[PDB]
Amino acid sequence: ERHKTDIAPISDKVLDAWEKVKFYQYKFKDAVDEKGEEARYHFGVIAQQIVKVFEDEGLSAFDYGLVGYDEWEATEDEYDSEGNLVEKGREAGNIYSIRPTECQWLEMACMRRKLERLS
């Protein structure tokens, strides 16, 4: 059934903000220090840029579940119950990710509209 509501065709300001996000190829700093430029290329969008094109059109990318934000506490380096080291933990950081399946949807809705030639 429908466990859904506020149901309707896709906002145009939204589709118009998405049309603003860019596609990139990039390598993960992770892999690259591991295998040098042996590291594979990945293709996709970039959260920080996304959160931005929606900001210009005056929207929030978080509201459409296109983007996530995550933040954390700085976890101890612990030697116990001696001067001995068991684990080396975390420096405080944060990270933006994306919710790819919601991004593909809006992308394909976007490219549906252009093909009707409304852009």
DSSP character string of 29-77? HHHHHHHGGGSPPEEE--HHHHHHHHHHTT--GGGGTSEEEEE------
32 is a site residue for Br ion (CB under 5 A): no
Residue 53 touches which of a second copy, Br ion, none (Cβ within 5-8 Å per kind): none
| Choice between 33 and 82, CB closer to a second copy | 33
For residue 116, the minimal CB distance to a second copy (Å) is: 10
101 is a site residue for a second copy (CB under 8 A): yes
CB of 74 within 8 A of CB of 92? Answer: yes
Give the footprint of Br ion on this chain (CB under 5 A): 31, 40
